[PDB]
Amino acid sequence: TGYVGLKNQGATCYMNSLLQTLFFTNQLRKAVYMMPTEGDDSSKSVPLALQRVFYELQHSDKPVGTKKLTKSFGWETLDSFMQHDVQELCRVLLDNVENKMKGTCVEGTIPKLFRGKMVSYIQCKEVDYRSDRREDYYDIQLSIKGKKNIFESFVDYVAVEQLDGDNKYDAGEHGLQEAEKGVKFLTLPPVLHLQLMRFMYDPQTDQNIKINDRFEFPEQLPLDEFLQKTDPKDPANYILHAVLVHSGDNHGGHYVVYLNPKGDGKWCKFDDDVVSRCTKEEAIEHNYGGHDDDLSVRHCTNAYMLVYIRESKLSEVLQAVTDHDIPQQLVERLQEEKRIEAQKRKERQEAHLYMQVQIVAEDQFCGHQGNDMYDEEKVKYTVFKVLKNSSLAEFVQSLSQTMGFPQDQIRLWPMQARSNGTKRPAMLDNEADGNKTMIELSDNENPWTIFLETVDPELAASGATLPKFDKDHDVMLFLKMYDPKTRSLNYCGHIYTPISCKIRDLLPVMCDRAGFIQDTSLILYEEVKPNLTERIQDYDVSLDKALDELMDGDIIVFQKDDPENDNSELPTAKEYFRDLYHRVDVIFCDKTIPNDPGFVVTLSNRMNYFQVAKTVAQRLNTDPMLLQFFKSQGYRDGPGNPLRHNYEGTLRDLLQFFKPRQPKKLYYQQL
């Protein structure tokens, strides 16, 4: 189209429609370029922000962005726009530029184009005391309700008011005299910003409604019959320039603008990033209004602001803007702003197409007391920066030197989370998926966690190569030894074993692992998932029969079969996993106390309101009845509605809002 558009409106609203209107106000644009803002802030200067947008709108072929602009004047809030409107934003920018041009060569450019002279008068009936109050104006507000065209609404604006019915002019010494209060014009500015009162408020309630009445406006607007005195050789004939339009309603809509940029009759629809040619009827007669289907919504389209230019001052306002009209100080600065921005994006494109893989060693598995191999928050990984679509062989090659281990004495066991929420080491061969990308091997997982099996250096130096693993008939299992006396879990490494191998044949290995005698009576459990720890019934059966759904990364927890186990808190390993599942440290902070540190209490997830309150009251040396707990929401972090004392559910239900990653915390208060 030649003219470039502005990037998509994101509750920007009318700002774009207004920017284009000001941008194609050529005489204004030239003054914008001639502003000393080479020493201002790069992200807090409104005039430079405009100079950026105007420059891009003139040279760029890509949809011009307005990020920088919204940050410069605190309207970056996603709702702080309908609080104001076009006439206000236009006053914000222009009075910010006018303020920033006082002293420059283009001093007072804004009043020359937009400012006109207006006189409000008050003439008494009996006495002859007038009130010639003279004011300037940049924007003219017009009435819509009951109006058919501009010619009517303009008369309504200059209509003579009467003051009767207990409403009388406070003359002072003459008391309350009945007078008039109409408005008259002295001069009409070259550029007329006429906002239309279509968003009148609705009392009551609430609070603003849009008037879709059919209001007309001409392409040629003679206004020489509205001044105090006519002016020959300079009639007030105005030509339509900009038509700002809205589709929808007050509480939600879409903004576009029909512009006549060189004022030649060639109109263009500036719908955001899509600039297109359009007819004159499509820009004028189609924007009068009339349709009022609340159901239909978009589209019920009509204009809310118009811009006219004086026919005599038409050639000067829409003056040709050459590229030489922009100071090199301004140019070179914006060029470097983008050179830094373009370089940054290149880095961010490299922030993409990259995945980091976390390597965990088996030394982390040692000493773990929770479920599974390791505690997610306590584990220390070895992170690597990997190409997203790098081959599997390239990763292994890079891992060999960075770890100081041979490329043959290591095996990579990927960590895949199972269906029942247990992240266990999966299997993946080196030569099988060698020519495959990492992002498809991880299956769109980033970051990716992989367990690294390394040969024990105590044997490697002596001479020991890492054994071969047959994916078809071999399975890798992990072992854990439980000591009831200490009530703790002791890690016993892992072992490769045939699938057809009986549990019985694996028993001498377990005894030697934990430092026991051969033919020692043991009790074996399978750690399936937390709080589930099924016991192996028969020992003289294969691995495929004993463990349900036999896979690589399965855990077998064993313990010494001894009558002394009964003489302890946690006899079996199954009971141990029940505590770890039921026990939970709850933080109880007082509601009335600001920033209360609180106190932790060890409870069970199967405690009802009674058992919970009884324990907390015991912790606080008081009667439970004097405690009022509150239903919580972790994310909102604020105590919701108070908790009744006849609550049937348990503590588990009250903590469903809290992720396991977060410390549980309930709120209370004293009665």
Side-chain angles (χ1 to χ4, degrees), residues 1-124 126-634 638-671:
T1 321
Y3 311 114
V4 78
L6 289 164
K7 207 109 82 173
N8 185 194
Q9 300 180 1
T12 74
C13 290
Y14 48 117
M15 195 197 40
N16 297 16
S17 306
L18 192 267
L19 288 178
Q20 299 284 358
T21 303
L22 295 187
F23 173 75
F24 285 101
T25 308
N26 296 125
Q27 190 172 8
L28 167 62
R29 184 208 302 178
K30 299 176 61 176
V32 175
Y33 289 149
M34 298 301 179
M35 299 175 61
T37 57
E38 66 283 348
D40 297 26
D41 192 273
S42 300
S43 300
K44 212 168 187 176
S45 181
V46 183
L48 174 60
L50 264 186
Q51 291 180 338
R52 289 190 295 261
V53 176
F54 281 173
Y55 173 79
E56 296 287 342
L57 282 173
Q58 181 174 335
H59 298 266
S60 173
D61 294 315
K62 298 167 56 183
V64 180
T66 59
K67 309 152 253 156
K68 289 290 193 60
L69 225 180
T70 61
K71 308 173 185 298
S72 59
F73 69 150
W75 283 27
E76 49 193 357
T77 308
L78 298 321
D79 57 88
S80 70
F81 265 96
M82 279 303 302
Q83 303 176 359
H84 326 81
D85 66 327
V86 268
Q87 63 203 48
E88 299 196 26
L89 215 177
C90 182
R91 280 170 72 185
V92 167
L93 297 181
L94 290 186
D95 258 326
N96 186 270
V97 174
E98 163 185 334
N99 169 266
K100 205 64 174 59
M101 289 190 308
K102 292 300 163 294
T104 335
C105 54
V106 286
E107 178 177 5
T109 307
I110 312 299
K112 183 54 185 180
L113 297 177
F114 302 98
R115 180 247 301 177
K117 294 301 180 180
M118 180 193 60
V119 172
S120 302
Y121 68 99
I122 294 180
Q123 190 70 21
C124 297
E126 300 81 8
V127 208
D128 179 58
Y129 174 76
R130 206 174 187 179
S131 179
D132 293 327
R133 195 188 82 269
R134 311 180 187 275
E135 293 179 345
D136 298 25
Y137 64 93
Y138 300 159
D139 40 50
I140 298 182
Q141 290 72 24
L142 298 179
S143 182
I144 299 303
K145 197 66 178 182
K147 313 303 176 183
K148 179 61 181 183
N149 45 82
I150 297 288
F151 198 92
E152 291 185 352
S153 185
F154 243 84
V155 171
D156 179 275
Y157 198 85
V158 296
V160 181
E161 190 183 356
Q162 296 291 341
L163 297 177
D164 304 335
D166 197 17
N167 324 90
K168 293 167 186 177
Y169 178 76
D170 186 34
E173 299 182 3
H174 304 270
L176 303 180
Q177 300 287 349
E178 299 182 354
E180 303 172 345
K181 201 166 66 64
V183 193
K184 276 295 183 177
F185 291 101
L186 292 186
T187 65
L188 285 173
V191 178
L192 282 176
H193 283 1
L194 310 182
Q195 294 82 5
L196 306 208
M197 312 298 328
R198 267 182 150 82
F199 298 93
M200 305 185 64
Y201 76 140
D202 174 79
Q204 296 289 352
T205 225
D206 42 19
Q207 180 62 219
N208 296 71
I209 61 176
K210 177 172 173 294
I211 315 178
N212 300 338
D213 289 21
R214 188 177 198 272
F215 184 79
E216 295 182 2
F217 50 93
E219 185 181 16
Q220 192 73 15
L221 182 58
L223 296 177
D224 216 337
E225 53 169 325
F226 288 85
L227 300 176
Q228 181 186 11
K229 182 198 302 179
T230 180
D231 192 89
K233 302 179 179 180
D234 197 335
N237 301 19
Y238 284 74
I239 309 181
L240 185 58
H241 180 65
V243 177
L244 292 82
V245 225
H246 173 267
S247 177
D249 208 327
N250 180 265
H251 299 268
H254 187 64
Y255 298 100
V256 297
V257 47
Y258 293 78
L259 259 165
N260 184 16
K262 24 196 73 293
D264 49 340
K266 305 184 189 301
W267 289 84
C268 301
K269 184 186 64 178
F270 285 97
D271 177 293
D272 281 25
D273 69 313
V274 184
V275 187
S276 58
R277 284 299 309 271
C278 62
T279 29
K280 197 174 301 180
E281 283 76 15
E282 186 174 334
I284 306 180
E285 305 170 28
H286 294 182
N287 280 3
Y288 291 163
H291 214 78
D292 204 338
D293 295 339
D294 69 309
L295 158 138
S296 181
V297 70
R298 340 214 285 204
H299 308 176
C300 56
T301 309
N302 41 81
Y304 61 92
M305 181 185 178
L306 305 171
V307 177
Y308 287 83
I309 307 181
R310 199 179 186 98
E311 188 179 4
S312 63
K313 299 297 176 298
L314 191 272
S315 301
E316 190 177 30
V317 167
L318 299 185
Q319 195 176 25
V321 180
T322 330
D323 303 331
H324 309 101
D325 302 28
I326 314 181
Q328 291 296 335
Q329 301 175 353
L330 226 186
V331 176
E332 297 177 10
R333 180 174 184 177
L334 304 190
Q335 304 257 26
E336 209 56 29
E337 274 200 17
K338 296 177 295 182
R339 183 171 179 176
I340 298 178
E341 280 185 351
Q343 183 177 6
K344 272 190 175 182
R345 231 48 199 155
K346 293 181 181 181
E347 313 256 86
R348 296 286 293 172
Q349 294 300 109
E350 293 179 351
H352 218 300
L353 48 85
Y354 258 86
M355 61 174 300
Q356 53 177 8
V357 180
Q358 307 178 13
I359 293 299
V360 51
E362 192 168 327
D363 77 85
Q364 298 291 284
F365 296 175
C366 303
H368 183 58
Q369 291 295 327
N371 297 132
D372 290 25
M373 315 311 173
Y374 59 173
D375 195 276
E376 184 59 37
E377 307 297 327
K378 308 173 184 178
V379 45
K380 307 173 184 59
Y381 298 97
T382 309
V383 189
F384 293 95
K385 185 192 220 302
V386 198
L387 297 166
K388 197 177 189 179
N389 63 331
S390 181
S391 63
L392 183 57
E394 281 184 347
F395 179 80
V396 185
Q397 184 188 26
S398 302
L399 192 65
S400 60
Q401 189 272 347
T402 325
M403 293 275 86
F405 298 110
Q407 202 170 354
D408 305 85
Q409 310 301 333
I410 52 100
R411 300 200 86 273
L412 268 60
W413 298 84
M415 211 81 72
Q416 252 64 29
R418 302 184 179 183
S419 184
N420 41 85
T422 49
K423 202 177 183 177
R424 302 273 199 66
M427 195 279 165
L428 204 60
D429 189 90
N430 177 84
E431 297 183 354
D433 307 88
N435 293 21
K436 295 185 60 181
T437 75
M438 299 301 297
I439 197 59
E440 76 194 17
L441 281 181
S442 60
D443 191 32
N444 297 270
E445 187 174 1
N446 185 28
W448 191 20
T449 301
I450 303 180
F451 167 65
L452 175 61
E453 178 182 358
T454 313
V455 180
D456 177 38
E458 200 77 3
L459 291 176
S462 179
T465 60
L466 209 160
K468 315 244 65 178
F469 170 76
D470 186 44
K471 335 160 303 178
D472 310 271
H473 308 98
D474 289 331
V475 52
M476 184 191 61
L477 306 175
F478 291 81
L479 270 60
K480 295 181 178 181
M481 189 270 295
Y482 180 74
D483 180 28
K485 180 180 178 299
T486 58
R487 311 182 314 272
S488 61
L489 281 181
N490 302 122
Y491 184 59
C492 289
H494 71 100
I495 42 96
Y496 290 89
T497 167
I499 303 175
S500 63
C501 183
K502 273 72 176 185
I503 306 282
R504 160 120 299 103
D505 302 331
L506 296 181
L507 299 181
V509 179
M510 300 187 176
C511 300
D512 178 84
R513 231 73 143 89
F516 298 154
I517 318 295
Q518 307 302 323
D519 296 329
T520 293
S521 184
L522 294 182
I523 311 177
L524 278 68
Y525 299 95
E526 176 194 2
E527 177 179 339
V528 181
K529 57 180 297 185
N531 183 26
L532 190 48
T533 316
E534 295 174 333
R535 182 192 176 201
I536 307 180
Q537 306 173 10
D538 202 337
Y539 285 152
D540 219 76
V541 294
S542 62
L543 288 174
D544 185 29
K545 298 179 181 180
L547 286 77
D548 63 319
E549 197 165 29
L550 176 64
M551 290 179 59
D552 297 275
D554 286 24
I555 312 182
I556 295 185
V557 188
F558 59 94
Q559 67 183 24
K560 171 59 183 177
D561 185 33
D562 199 306
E564 297 178 59
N565 298 337
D566 305 271
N567 308 92
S568 178
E569 175 182 356
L570 300 175
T572 66
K574 182 178 185 60
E575 297 166 292
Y576 173 84
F577 286 138
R578 218 137 56 90
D579 283 35
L580 186 137
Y581 182 81
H582 290 165
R583 272 191 169 95
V584 46
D585 295 88
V586 189
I587 302 179
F588 293 97
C589 295
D590 187 272
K591 186 194 186 69
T592 66
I593 302 180
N595 295 21
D596 181 43
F599 57 96
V600 288
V601 177
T602 57
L603 299 175
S604 173
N605 284 319
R606 303 192 313 174
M607 287 185 175
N608 53 334
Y609 185 92
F610 178 80
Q611 290 174 342
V612 171
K614 279 287 174 298
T615 309
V616 180
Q618 144 75 2
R619 188 67 145 83
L620 244 48
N621 305 18
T622 174
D623 192 275
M625 291 242 63
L626 275 67
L627 295 182
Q628 237 284 352
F629 301 96
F630 295 83
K631 312 175 73 179
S632 173
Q633 319 102 128
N641 300 18
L643 183 63
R644 275 264 232 269
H645 73 282
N646 65 334
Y647 185 70
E648 283 183 315
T650 175
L651 180 57
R652 176 186 304 268
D653 305 272
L654 300 179
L655 300 167
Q656 80 172 24
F657 275 69
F658 270 91
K659 281 290 186 176
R661 312 172 181 86
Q662 314 173 16
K664 278 74 183 304
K665 175 176 57 183
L666 293 180
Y667 281 78
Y668 77 104
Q669 67 172 358
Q670 294 286 358
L671 298 183

